[PDB]
C-alpha cells in the first residue's frame, strides 16, 4: 500500500502540472472566421474547422 | 463468530465507544483505510481486487 500511494502521489501531481500550464484562461473563445488579419496569415496556427 | 477485521474507537478513559466492520460494504473499508470516521469529499484509493 505504501507503493500505491507513492505512485498515486506522482500520478495526481503529474496531472496537476497539465492544468497549470494550459488552463490559464477562464473563457473559451471561438475561432474567428477571418484567418487573415491585415495581411498576416494565421492558417497554419489556428485549427481548420 | 467470524474471523474478520474490525476498527475500534477508544475514548480518553479506555472505553470502546464505536466500531466499524471493515468487510461490510465499500464505504466501510474506506473508513478503515484512512483511519477516520469522518471523511472529506474526494477520490480515495483503496485495496486491490
Ligand atoms: C495563407 O497561407 C496558406 C498556406 O498555408 C493558404 O492555405 C492554402 O492555400 C492554398 C492556395 O490558396 C489553398 O489551395 C486551394 O484549395 C482549393 C480547394 O479545392 C483547391 O482546389 C485549389 O487548387 C486549385 O488552384 C491551384 C492554384 O491556384 C492549383 O494548383 C490546383 O490544381 C487547383 O487548380 C487551391 O490550391 C488551400 O486550400 C489553403 N489551405 C487551406 C487549409 O484552406 C491560405 O490560402 C493563405 N491565406 C489566404 C487568405 O489566402
Ligand atoms: C472519563 O473519565 C473521567 C473521570 O476521570 C470523567 O470525567 C468526569 O465526568 C464527570 C461527569 O461527566 C464530571 O462531573 C467530572 O468533573 C469529570 N472529571 C474529570 C477529572 O474530568 C469523564 O466523564 C469520562 N469520559 C466520558 C466520555 O464519560
From Swiss-Prot, chain A:
<protein>
    <recommendedName>
        <fullName>Spike protein S2</fullName>
    </recommendedName>
</protein>
<comment type="function">
    <text>Mediates fusion of the virion and cellular membranes by acting as a class I viral fusion protein. Under the current model, the protein has at least three conformational states: pre-fusion native state, pre-hairpin intermediate state, and post-fusion hairpin state. During viral and target cell membrane fusion, the coiled coil regions (heptad repeats) assume a trimer-of-hairpins structure, positioning the fusion peptide in close proximity to the C-terminal region of the ectodomain.</text>
</comment>
<feature type="glycosylation site" description="N-linked (GlcNAc...) asparagine; by host">
    <location>
        <position position="41"/>
    </location>
</feature>
